[PDB]
Amino acid sequence: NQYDVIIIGSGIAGALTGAVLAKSGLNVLILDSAQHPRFSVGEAATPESGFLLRLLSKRFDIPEIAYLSHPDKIIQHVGSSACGIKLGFSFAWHQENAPSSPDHLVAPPLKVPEAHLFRQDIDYFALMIALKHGAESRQNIKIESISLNDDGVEVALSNAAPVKAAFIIDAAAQGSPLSRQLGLRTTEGLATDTCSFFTHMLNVKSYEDALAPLSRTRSPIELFKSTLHHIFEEGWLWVIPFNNHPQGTNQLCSIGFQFNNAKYRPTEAPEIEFRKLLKKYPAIGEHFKDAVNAREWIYAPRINYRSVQNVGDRFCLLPQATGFIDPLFSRGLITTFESILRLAPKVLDAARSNRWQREQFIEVERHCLNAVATNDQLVSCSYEAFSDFHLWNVWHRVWLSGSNLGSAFLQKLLHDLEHSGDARQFDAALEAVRFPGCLSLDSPAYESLFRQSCQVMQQAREQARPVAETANALHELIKEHEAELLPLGYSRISNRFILK
Numbered sequence: 284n285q286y287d288v289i290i291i292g293s294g295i296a297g298a299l300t301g302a303v304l305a306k307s308g309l310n311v312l313i314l315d316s317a318q319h320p321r322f323s324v325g326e327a328a329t330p331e332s333g334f335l336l337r338l339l340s341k342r343f344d345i346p347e348i349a350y351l352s353h354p355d356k357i358i359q360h361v362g363s364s365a366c367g368i369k370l371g372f373s374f375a376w377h378q379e380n381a382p383s384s385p386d387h388l389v390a391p392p393l394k395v396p397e398a399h400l401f402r403q404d405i406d407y408f409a410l411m412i413a414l415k416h417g418a419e420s421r422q423n424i425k426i427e428s429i430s431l432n433d434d435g436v437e438v439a440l441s442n443a444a445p446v447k448a449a450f451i452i453d454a455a456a457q458g459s460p461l462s463r464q465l466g467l468r469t470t471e472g473l474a475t476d477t478c479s480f481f482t483h484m485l486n487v488k489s490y491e492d493a494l495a496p497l498s499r500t501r502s503p504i505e506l507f508k509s510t511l512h513h514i515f516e517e518g519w520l521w522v523i524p525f526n527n528h529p530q531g532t533n534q535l536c537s538i539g540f541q542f543n544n545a546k547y548r549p550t551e552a553p554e555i556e557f558r559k560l561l562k563k564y565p566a567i568g569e570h571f572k573d574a575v576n577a578r579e580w581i582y583a584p585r586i587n588y589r590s591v592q593n594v595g596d597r598f599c600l601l602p603q604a605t606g607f608i609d610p611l612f613s614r615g616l617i618t619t620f621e622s623i624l625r626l627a628p629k630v631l632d633a634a635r636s637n638r639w640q641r642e643q644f645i646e647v648e649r650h651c652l653n654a655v656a657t658n659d660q661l662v663s664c665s666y667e668a669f670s671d672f673h674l675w676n677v678w679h680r681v682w683l684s685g686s687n688l689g690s691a692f693l694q695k696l697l698h699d700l701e702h703s704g705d706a707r708q709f710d711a712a713l714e715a716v717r718f719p720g721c722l723s724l725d726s727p728a729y730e731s732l733f734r735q736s737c738q739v740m741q742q743a744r745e746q747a748r749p750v751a752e753t754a755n756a757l758h759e760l761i762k763e764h765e766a767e768l769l770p771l772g773y774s775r776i777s778n779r780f781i782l783k
């Protein structure tokens with residue numbers, strides 16, 4: 284065995300995984316069929332992924348990882364093109380055959396700013412961290428075959444000798460090449476069935492210029508400085524600027540749109556489908572009067588999948604290779620960084636004791652498969668809440684209250700790790716959470732609210748209930764549980780901009 288671990292994929296997941304393991308004294312080999320620089324999506328950072336990056340940084344003593352958690356540190360250390368800013372998520376509702384109202388808006392702001400990750404620059408910087416810590420990288424290779432045995436892993440490569448290792452990690456946000464070989468990938472059982480078109484554009488107007496200024500919306504933040512979601516019956520469109528930072532030099536804006544395939548199936552080329560969508564929703568079209576594509580539109584007819592298994596004796600699929608649901612709420616990155624945090628110490632224990640059995644990595648699988656299941660519920664119920672604004676206003680508080688509890692929990696673990704400096708206590712605290720993969724992590728009150736809310740949403744879809752009743756049902760449930768949530772005034776429905 285030439286190496287200890289082989290990592291497929293050299294984007295942010297595999298790069299950070301290689302960084303922490305190489306730092307810890309393993310001989311890592313990162314493999315990739317693509318080569319840097321390259322384009323990538325999964326751009327919206329969240330407070331959770333912010334804390335999880337700072338946790339990775341502190342747990343393994345790699346300060347450069349912490350730089351990726353804050354837009355000012357990104358600009359300073361990665362580069363001035365490497366991110367835009369975000370002061371919150373924001374959602375603006377629309378319907379076919381009616382003018383869009385700037386009062387049909389929700390946008391809960393952040394205290395601490397976050398990044399819109401320009402992934403080509405962030406991913407390359409991440410690989411840099413890995414390379415500087417001893418990990419070998421090989422780009423632009425083709426994997427003929429992967430063989431899993433009792434004594435190791437062997438990877439065959441085109442125009443090169445095969446490479447042997449103790450363990451293999453699949454960190455490809457790609458078509459899960461190892462999961463496709465193992466036959467673990469499936470669409471069966473997913474509530475979500477969504478397609479996606481996405482690209483980067485130039486000369487995209489801000490929300491303030493194109494639809495409605497700050498004086499009309501009454502928002503505490505510019506929507507230009509937010510992860511903007513345009514939502515409507517059959518799906519949603521994102522507007523994620525990289526050109527909204529005062530110190531930034533990036534001119535592009537990420538643009539993507541998703542359809543619920545149960546409601547609408549696209550039939551034509553992306554650019555035709557794009558012009559049809561803007562005719563249907565003319566207010567959304569005001570963003571793109573002067574706009575130009577800076578790259579080819581990528582179409583993906585089915586973005587949703589899950590896996591029945593993701594760990595074995597001598598392999599592990601990281602969440603991005605295990606399953607994906609939807610870019611909505613940007614749960615992809617959260618699941619990924621948390622999985623690396625759980626997996627890394629166990630792979631070290633395995634390598635330091637030469638024990639490679641499925642049993643050891645079983646809590647990595649539990650977290651990952653739950654996170655994809657919870658993310659499926661969240662998104663599918665959210666796609667149903669798109670049908671009316673008032674319903675969306677009440678529903679988004681379910682996501683928000685959970686997300687806040689998740690964040691506060693990760694602050695607690697970060698604060699306790701910073702104080703005590705005890706890596707063993709942290710690993711155990713993380714594994715001992717009552718609801719791994721779920722939004723709150725360790726709150727029985729919230730997971731009660733989430734479960735019953737999703738039951739109300741899925742019942743409302745099945746029986747086609749009136750939106751005013753469903754909204755009230757959820758409003759009651761929020762009032763019932765509000766004492767156990769944080770004191771942010773979630774039940775006050777007239778407040779559409781929930782402060783901290």
Ligand SMILES: Oc1cc(O)cc(O)c1
Nearest residue numbers: 372391392393686687690
């Ligand atoms: O995007 C987010 C906004 C907010 O106010 C809280 C949170 O956890 C996420």
